[PDB]
Design a protein around this ligand. Structure first.
Ligand SMILES: Cc1cc(=O)c(O)c(C(=O)NCc2ccc(-c3ccccc3C#N)cc2)o1
Length: 304
């Protein structure tokens, strides 16, 4: 069985490179961030523009939703994160502390915490209620490319251009494990699987790898795409068939069979690097976003 994703909507409106797209947990919305310093909110099923949220002084690298779909956090080149009320568009908190570009962000499942990673090589854990930094982790010796909580929020994984993925205890801020091999090329993205037992990591040698967290060993490698430069988002698609979904520097969305590692689809449409993909929480829907020569988001749907 293969999926049959087909283009349903093209979401135009950003005036510069799109940097991230994320579906709200309740499945109703898509948020996008851009080098044009804006966040846009769109209908998840029809691609209908809903609103623009503005306030950052420089480009935005990432956006992430709270578990109740009411708040957004954005990570900016202006060295700050902002927490937004989605329904009003108001900035509730500005999180200051990083000394350089903030590249990545995520809420924990309870959504009382935010984790951020920065060009300043640190990982920070922030209290949502107060906006206070709770912990600064001396995580890496190069820019932090991604940060992600596991399904119960007890662990954080961080990745970096230094080649390591590190798993941290959220409560204590101590490192529990480093995912490491004989050779360790730059890691451009990392995330836990939805079941919490595995980690997906992208390296800048055109490879994605699935690691067993318990054993600290690689189980599967996915190749065929191009990724030598950019921090490209990848995903587990779990609503229908079990796929790995990623963008690519050949401007395609790649879909692999999780178990066999075979490419099952390549989605064509974007006219620049597909920097971000996201998978809808309940329906077989993928969102893809592209850089400056394209500036669009595309929504794709499959029966499978
Ligand atoms: C909560 C949630 C709901 C889902 O439907 C779902 O597919 C996921 C998930 O993490 N899929 C992703 C996923 C599924 C299976 C495996 C896997 C690979 C090799 C050997 C064993 C296994 C296992 N086992 C890895 C990742 O978890």
């Amino acid at each position: 069985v293969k999926p049959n994703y087909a283009l349903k909507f093209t979401l135009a409106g950003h005036t510069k490179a799109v940097s991230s797209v994320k579906f709200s947990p309740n499945g109703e919305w898509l948020a996008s961030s851009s080098a044009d310093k804006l966040i846009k909110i769109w209908g998840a099923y029809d691609g209908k523009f809903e609103k623009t949220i503005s306030g950052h002084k420089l480009g935005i690298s990432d956006v992430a939703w709270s578990s109740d779909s009411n708040l957004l956090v954005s990570a900016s080149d202006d060295k700050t994160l902002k927490i937004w009320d989605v329904s009003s568009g108001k900035c509730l908190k500005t999180l200051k502390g990083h000394s350089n570009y903030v590249f990545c962000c995520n809420f924990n499942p309870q959504s009382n915490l935010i984790v951020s990673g920065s060009f300043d090589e640190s990982v920070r854990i922030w209290d949502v209620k107060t906006g206070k930094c709770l912990k600064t982790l001396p995580a890496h010796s190069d820019p932090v490319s991604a940060v992600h909580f596991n399904r119960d929020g007890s662990l954080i994984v961080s990745s970096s251009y230094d080649g390591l993925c590190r798993i941290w205890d959220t409560a204590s801020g101590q490192c529990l494990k480093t995912l490491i091999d004989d050779d360790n090329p730059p890691v451009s993205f990392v995330k836990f699987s939805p079941n919490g037992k595995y980690i997906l990591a992208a390296t800048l040698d055109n490879t994605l790898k699935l690691w067993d967290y318990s054993k600290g060993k690689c189980l599967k490698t996915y190749t065929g795409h191009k990724n030598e430069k950019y921090c490209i988002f990848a995903n587990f698609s779990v609503t229908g068939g079990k796929w790995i979904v990623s963008g690519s520097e050949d401007n395609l969305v790649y879909i692999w069979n999780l178990q066999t590692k075979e490419i099952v689809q390549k989605l064509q449409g974007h006219t620049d690097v597909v920097i971000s993909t996201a998978c809808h929480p309940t329906e077989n829907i993928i969102a893809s976003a592209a850089l400056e020569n394209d500036k669009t988001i595309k929504l794709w749907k499959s029966d499978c």
